Symmetry: C2
Subunit: 311 residues, 2 copies
Amino acid sequence: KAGILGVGRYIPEKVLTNHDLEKMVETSDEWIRTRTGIEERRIAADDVFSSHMAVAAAKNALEQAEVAAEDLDMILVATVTPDQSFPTVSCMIQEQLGAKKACAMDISAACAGFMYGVVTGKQFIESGTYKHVLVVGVEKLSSITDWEDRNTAVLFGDGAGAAVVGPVSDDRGILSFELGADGTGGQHLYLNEKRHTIMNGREVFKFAVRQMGESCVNVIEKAGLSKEDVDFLIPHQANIRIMEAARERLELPVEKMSKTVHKYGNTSAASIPISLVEELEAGKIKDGDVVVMVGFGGGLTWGAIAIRWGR
Amino acid sequence: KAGILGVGRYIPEKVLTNHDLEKMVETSDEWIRTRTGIEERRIAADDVFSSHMAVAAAKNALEQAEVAAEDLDMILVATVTPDQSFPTVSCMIQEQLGAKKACAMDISAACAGFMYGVVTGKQFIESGTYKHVLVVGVEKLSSITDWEDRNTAVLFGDGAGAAVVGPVSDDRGILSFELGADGTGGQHLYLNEKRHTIMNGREVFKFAVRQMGESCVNVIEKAGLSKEDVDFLIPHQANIRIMEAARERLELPVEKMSKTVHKYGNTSAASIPISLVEELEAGKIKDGDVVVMVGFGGGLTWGAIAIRWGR
């Protein structure tokens, strides 16, 4: 069975508060908090790109996993904001990390990308093909944000999260997963010709609130478990109201769902690993815990994973 | 075992000859043919994007495979020129094809992308996760070509190729594969700030000529076969001189290596499936044939696959 050996993240140091946003666009601290739950988000410096954030998250994950970069068989980077289209971020961090024998590809599934990546790594490991797969979710959404548009400029932050996937001692590891997509919703969330994110917020909300909880129930069902068997939920950190719908569907207490949207905003593919690190650093997730992760993203993509934590 | 159920392609109708190039840049028909072997290449119309070419290739592959789009479990599109970063081409063609239950992600491994994709599909099928995986290699390189630069504007064409991957009756299917990358070479082939392909042609040549043949030998070795066991070689169609080096390393006759670079140029991830369709339409590849495919790409990525043809 494939499981998670270690996780790391990179959080940019610059804090962008709602009151910093109040200068830039016609918004209010009250409106942002009430509708999204965001209070702050982090913004990468002008010389810090997805590759810089990804190497930092990757180094921390490798250190936590006790895995050397030279031992990686595969590097997968989920991003829609690479430094450039080619060379990919995965190729760039393969060089900077010294991961010589590793293959490298970037994958694009928007905010569901980290889930697509972990599931992809799972397939390569359980077939016996590879042993160690590095999966990184990284976004510099600040580089594709119309900072004049109050409807989106208050939603997005920057960051990177990373996990080393590998074989774990059985009972542990990824128990089940679901990956999905619905190209019909492509009109509702797209990058326009100015490389600016355009979103139909109402439509994306309707879709997310009903799909997040359903993907969660599916992976619990596929794992042969019950809702009471879930020890922690790590949702994509886009909107506290969407996150709350998933918590209700799973009948989980407030303290069993990771909440970092208020401090980092929506970091797209980086969101789930960033939240994972937060809970692991607070000691709220322990070996043997059943953890459900779930995300939705642009293009209308989604994914969910049920994992029993530990090696 | 996972194998290839059917293949299709889309070739743009507009032909760009070397004599059309002679008006545009300071080049000559003699120089292009002598150094690359290219005589013509195809250019997609201004209203034809990667998604349009990918749906066309996908439809032809599904028809040849006798697979309905509604039965696809996964859509993988290898491209560095999507219509936009999100929604992805895979999401776009998931909608246009009516592939409702299918998940969808784009992958980025430059000219090696189709190989990364087929191997990825192989992992999902042989684990029993999925049954039918659509893999598309598509590029509109004309949209990232500096048409003022004679060093690259004579190298690239547009196109799409597609394969349906699924379980095949054993003895058949993908016997072995190799995926690789070397981020060190990222400086030699990259997209610059104008979305123009910049290349150190001499360096990329040195790398490709020695890696194409070596990847080929590796996958033959991993399949437990000999060089005499190879019935056909389908190399990435970037440069006839690079292709010839691979043919020599495998001791193969001229008529057992696919050559379409002279008519389509370098189509990056689309190159191998486009050549596959060409040989299948000429009846040169038959069930039971051992086919080796191999490619190299920007970021310095590479891949090779040995497949026994048939279902």
